[model samples]
Target: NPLLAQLKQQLHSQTPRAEGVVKATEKGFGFLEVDAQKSYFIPPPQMKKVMHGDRIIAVIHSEKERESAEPEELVEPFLTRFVGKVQGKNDRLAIVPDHPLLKDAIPCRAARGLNHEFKEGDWAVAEMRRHPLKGDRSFYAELTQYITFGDDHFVPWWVTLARHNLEKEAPDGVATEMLDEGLVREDLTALDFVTIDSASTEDMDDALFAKALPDDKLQLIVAIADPTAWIAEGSKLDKAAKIRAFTNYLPGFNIPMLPRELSDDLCSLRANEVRPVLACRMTLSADGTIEDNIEFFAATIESKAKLVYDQVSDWLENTGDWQPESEAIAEQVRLLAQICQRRGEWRHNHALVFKDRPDYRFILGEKGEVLDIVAEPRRIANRIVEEAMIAANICAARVLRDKLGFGIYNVHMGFDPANADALAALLKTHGLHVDAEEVLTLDGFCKLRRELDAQPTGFLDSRIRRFQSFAEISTEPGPHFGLGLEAYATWTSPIRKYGDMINHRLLKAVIKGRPQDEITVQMAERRRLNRMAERDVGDWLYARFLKDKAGTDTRFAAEIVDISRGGMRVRLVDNGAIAFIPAPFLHAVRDELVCSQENGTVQIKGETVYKVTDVIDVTIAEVRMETRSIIARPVA
Candidate 1:
């Protein structure tokens, strides 16, 4: 027995061992990804012992100079509880994970708390009950909850909501009784404030009123809806909204963070209805420089009229025959336009203002299918609201930073220092000599953006964006390099954004002269998830819209947004739908084509052929509904 045990130990020691996470492909086999550069192939027979995303120790078996992995022990499991769709008929019930790569359908049955029977294509939450590396050496799951039926019209919305772990439905409405106790609010109902939003917007959050002053200066009042006055901190509604963070805007629907009774009724700054507001009154010179004394106070404002963006812009631009019925409202609109012009000029000269880009609004059918897409350009009225909000938010940031120790600030650190050298090198190749150190600072980055804009093409601007860091919510007062501001905080849309609500409470505390409520860092991930859900639903609709149009001769004008080793993602200029052009498709007619992610260019036989921002013609090639990707081919 001693000799046999010694022989087995020697044999086990001779075998090579590797530890990594199991990564599965569409095929039956998988791979042990030890690191980014190292991976071992897991044969189909051996893959049965492990599930995708399982961290395990594997023994490498060598045969015919080829190596494969045999999973021995599990370290961790990735699929504990995940979103999935029920597949197969009653007798062969399986749940295919909604994941992109892991397509394995594990046998599943109804678990506890599942009230209804799950049928084919039903979306449900599944929990992994058994794993192959565990006791029984097999994978199994149980459906925990039924999310939605497969034939539901709003399947995309429900599935996306479940996947993001967001509340699928709006929170229950609560009775809204005025509760601004011990708080004094000014009666500013005669200010003639007006809300500028879409024609169908029900949950209006901001109203504006501007007037001219004697010294060639203007006074602007930004009255934002006061939801915090009714919903106290740590209340049920407050906790619910804090978890949601922001409203999830899908293709044609929005999951409100708060209840309808509040967001769409009491807190909505409806026209002619006196509503509570946290208002900011600021004075700006003709040149758009804000005076030091910016006032934040609580007020009741009765909006004179509800203005629509297109209608107001049409009147202001003198492009249409539309005008407000009230002469006083007309005068205020003109004065606001004047303020917008001045403030925009100031920002354009001192700070960075994004170029006017058209936004595509999707028109959905009964089943949430994309029926049409309307491209709405940023017009005059839109700029008026934007400038007012910017000024108010900037003032709020200053007040919070100076009064309170900290508040929620939107911070954008121009370019990551890690990408500084790469950005400098990219600029240098484009004949723009720049120091890597200068690009890291705010002023230098603004100058570089200007230089990049001056280029005949937008390739450099798009490439530079890759090096720039994304804007994020931070508690510390930091410079927002993206907006070209010293510090920026937003309390303009408290009804829609939870962060803005937090900021409103902070600003109110400063105004009330009471100690600010205990504040914590708001999670930025929920915001990202909300944005992702919006984008994902858009993609799903686009794919569905293009399902029957694939391989047709409909050539769409598109701008190259990104280029990688595999393919390129192009934004359709017409509808804003993104489509992918595979590398092979780029070389379909020209075999010598090459795409470089590093240089951010596509070359053909040493000649530059395509770059970011290049407008090209393409046609839909295929629509992969499962992945929500629109495959496109360049028009020959």
Candidate 2:
């Protein structure tokens, strides 16, 4: 023990003191990047102990040929119960975790009553029992929880992770009693505020209510569940939320931040039950400018109806009659839409509105198969909700920055200045010319986007997608490039997002005149980590789904959504989902040809086709058009 302690200290000192989230591969190797710019490889053998997205402190050791970073210490372990399938021989029972970052099959023994009785292919959660390397590699686990049979679908895995992570927050001797109390009271219902969401959404996090006020002002009330009340700081629930940071939604699974009782039942603004909430009441002028905003704590509210985007959008657009269920709610919905339109016009006139096509949704079958993909067009209700949420989020950010002086804001600075020249050149070829430096202002950038849209070139459209990743940090309000807002940060979905939940808590704390504890800081970091975890899982699942869908002789119509040097990204019109078509697959004289000069199309092969159907995956990031006949020479 003494020798081990000395070794750990020595290793910690020798380690190349770097900090970043851990990214684990299925191949057993791991990589840690201190910043997004550089990554150090971690050996497969050393990866047996940690899961992906673990905020870790690692030591880098230099060999003659290369430098290697090893997990010297774990500043935080995001995952405790790993959902996986039981594997290995009769006496050699181990669990191979379904998570891509968890490489080593957790070792288990058949001694005592702790032996795993699970068979191969049975999904279960392996409770981490011991560490093989004390601080680094080698993890010993026991199969403690059963999730389901077969490939654990995305939903079950997400729920299980949420449960597992939340279990850590329960104070000693408090969990069983709290569960028995049922957490939420079934009475004291508020007016049923309808949920305006995408038609496909099952896990809704927001509900809306609005009324016109006197003197040309509108009163908009946004009731968000007070998740912080249920899961206090430094509790088991809070710990789990930190580990998850936010919900992760893969093709078929969703890892929720809170347990089912809270996320779906208690904290959920579900109809017919009194739920605790953090309500944001705002007053807006007729011109769509917010006049004043106020936040309430521990308010009880109920959702009256569950409204879908299509139904609400149709009613707003006067294309469809309001169903009896939403007739009373339609009045407020119409008012919200008018306010949102005013807001949208104001932004579009003053700044920029990055309006793009929506991605298609895919219905997956068992064994991770894509059953369908169809286009999902943007609707009026979507914009209405977007404007409302952005307005609310900006109000929340302002409150936190100007009033509370706590919490982090999600800020975006325009595109990277380094990429300006490339973007300018791309715009020049499309008959649009603007100084690279001049395009940084809100109006200047808006003008450039308008010019590009008027051109008949697909090349300019593709270039814009690359600019989506630029984000900056700020304590004060700044522009959100994506939303084209001067000040923005989300505070609407505290039940699913840690940042939102933390914002709720910070706001509540400010209202109550209480100081934030150490737990708030931890929750913020946890939320960031959860976001990374969810993205990694989504990418892996989509990739696997694409691999399964390849080679199928299915024809579907798709639009050319994005183009790059390597390929074109297409959004299938059928399901509104996205897939890519590589450059090599297209027959063209030059590697880079404008899709249309008049309509901005480059002739791929022979026909001037605006839409392509019957495409299948030819590679991981590439797709092939099956029905096209003419073969043009590949660009050399």
Model 1 per-residue lDDT tens digits across residues 569-593: 8999999999999898887645578
Clashes of each: 0, 41
For model 2, what is the error of residue 99's alpha carbon versus the real structure, in angstroms, after optimal superposition?
15
What does candidate 2's lDDT look like per residue over 328-435, in tens digits? 676767777877777777666655675665654557677665565455677788887887786777777666666655665666666677676777776677567778
Among these predictions, the greatest TM-score belongs to 1
**Once superposed on the true structure, which residue ranges of model 2 sit more than 4 Å away at CA?**
1-193, 197-204, 293-298, 317-322, 325-327, 354-357, 365-370, 420-433, 441-443, 464-469, 472-476, 509-554, 558-573, 576-585, 588-636
Which candidate tops lDDT? 1
Q: Kindly report which residue stretches of model 1 are placed more than 4 angstroms away from their true locations once superposed.
A: 1-42, 47-78, 88-92, 133-136, 514-522, 589-591
Candidate 1 backbone overlaps, count: 0
User: Which 10 consecutive residues of model 2 have the lowest summed lDDT?
Assistant: 626-635
